[PDB]
């Protein structure tokens, strides 16, 4: 039975125009910040990445919330893996010429995430007061969050771009060979990779000089060209339910996270856990016949089921970094995974009551 699922998808599709209205305000403010950021010597090669739920056509439930990525090309870099994490790294430089534009942010031979982000926040803070066209406020440190016309929030991330070969930790990741082909995997790995400033906490405290790997652009490519067949979702006979299953999984977590926001258990779960689990199910079911539109109910049930297995077994590997486990006991406590398991199972057993705005 896919009736309630198909109902939700139609309701979610009605948010397209509202998201579009808000997006216009954001494109205006962002184009302005990039024009002013490009003036500084350090952030000269800064640009808009254009990755995320929005550009992957999976943006469900929040027109007053946008996430934007700012890429900055860094030329000849050397990476040093932090504490055998496989996902966190220190950014070092190797050549002599020319005079590196980021020299000002070096805290030794290592590029400071804090000094980099401070200048980024400083230029952004300086340019939001100069702009009079719309009312823009910058929200406090908790990378940079704006509030346009007192409604739209914009989360702005800075990401370093490296056209180098992907780190060794990714060597056995992106298992798309039997689904999207090895030909495609070769083409995709030749593309750049990004590093977003994210500190790593070992329990005692922060490492505020590390950068985490990002493949937002590859996730978009894979989601927007997702079939084994090149004509998947181009004709009546070749329509699939891949994206619809991801939209439903994303919405399932958001609704349950909303329902229990005052409880604090589900705070550690994110749409990235859902998306990662989704890509794993795509690897398990490589055929477009396994994703038939008529089988939506059965396909979403495998996604729910796989996600629950990950919660029980405390095992959800990053799709690009196999050795990094997103459901490690050190990241998410067992009681929290058990609460989310309890809730998802109840929902599945009662024809998803949370789909009806709880
Ligand atoms: O939200 C995200 N992730 C959350 C889920 C658990 C771990 C960090 C959490 C957080 O940063 O809040 C997230 C959104 N894109 N993206 C991405 O492109 C890569 C990674 C990633 C994560 C771990 C290891 C290697 C790469 N994460 C993300
Ligand atoms: Zn398709």
Author numbering: 161 to 302, 307 to 522
Paper text:
Cyclic GMP-AMP synthase (cGAS) is the most recently identified member of the family of cytosolic DNA sensors. Cytosolic cGAS binds dsDNA and in the presence of ATP and GTP catalyzes the production of the recently characterized second messenger 2′, 3′- cyclic AMP-GMP (cGAMP) which then binds to Stimulator of Interferon Genes (STING). In humans, the binding of the cGAS product to STING causes a conformational change resulting in recruitment of TBK1, and interferon-inducible gene activation and interferon production via IRF3 phosphorylation and nuclear translocation.
The evidence linking activation of the cGAS pathway to autoimmune disease suggests that cGAS inhibitors may have therapeutic efficacy. Structure-based drug design and chemical optimization of the original fragment hit resulted in a high affinity lead that binds in the nucleotide binding site and inhibits cGAS activity.
